[PDB]
Amino acid sequence: AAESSIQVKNKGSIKLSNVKSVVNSSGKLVITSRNTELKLIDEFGRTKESYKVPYGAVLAKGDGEQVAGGETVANWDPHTMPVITEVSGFVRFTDMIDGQTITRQTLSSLVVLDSAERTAGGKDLRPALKIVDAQGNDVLIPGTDMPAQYFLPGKAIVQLEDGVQISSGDTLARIPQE
């Protein structure tokens, strides 16, 4: 619990460095950058506390917000790391076939078969969740001309249904972690 959240020990303001954040469909302010540092500072920039904050962490307070001592200001899953969409749209399953690239596992979930666990044809397959607009047009990742296709590494856990509406910052899949 403590290893996967930040609770500040004194009042101060949140200062985030190297951060990209977006609000998802659950009303969570989610960090989508991978080398973010969160600092508790005073009004003059003196550092009180400093923490690294992982990709996918949820913030209760954004950059520049004042917080009081004892307040929990970030939370992330201790045992998984997410794959998060950077764009809003609708989910489209790609190369996701039961028994060949994914298996059902149990609430139920789709689990991506790693390379060795796949049928002959499946080893050439690359399961992905593509984000499309309402019409089915490919959506591009912001900053690039690259499509918002998120491939799933083996053991990735997916709970989304195909075709479902999705918002930027929503988790596409979770990679099981120690």
Contact letters for Na ion, residues 159-178 (x by CB under 5 A) = --------xxx---------
Is the CB of 29 or the CB of 41 nearer to Na ion?
29
Q: How far is the CB of 176 from Na ion (least distance, A)?
A: 15
Name the nearest CA neighbour of 69 among 10, 14, 13, 15: 10
- State the Cα–Cα distance between residues 130 and 86, nearest whole angstrom: 11
Contact window for Na ion (CB under 5 A) among 3-11, 44-52, 107-115, 116-124: 3-11
Contact window for Na ion (CB under 5 A) among 75-83, 93-101, 104-112, 141-149: 75-83
DSSP-assigned beta bridge partners for residue 51:
38
Total residues found in the chain within this entry: 178
Task: Say how many residues touch Na ion, by CB under 5 A.
Answer: 6
Q: Is 5 in the site for Na ion (CB under 5 A)?
A: yes
Q: How far is the CB of 169 from Na ion (least distance, A)?
A: 5
Q: Are 87 and 142 in contact (CB under 8 A)?
A: yes
Burial degree of 6 (CB within 10 A; 0-12, 13-18, 19+)? buried
Is the CB of 168 or the CB of 171 nearer to Na ion?
168
Q: Is 7 in the site for Na ion (CB under 5 A)?
A: no
Helix, strand, coil content of the chain in percent (nearest 5): 5, 45, 55
Among 7, 13, 75, 94, binds Na ion (CB under 5 A): 75
Q: Are 18 and 36 in contact (CB under 8 A)?
A: yes
Terminal C-alpha separation, the chain:
14
Is the CB of 74 or the CB of 102 nearer to Na ion?
74
Q: Is 32 in the site for Na ion (CB under 5 A)?
A: no
Contacting residues toward Na ion, per CB under 5 A: 4-5, 75, 167-169
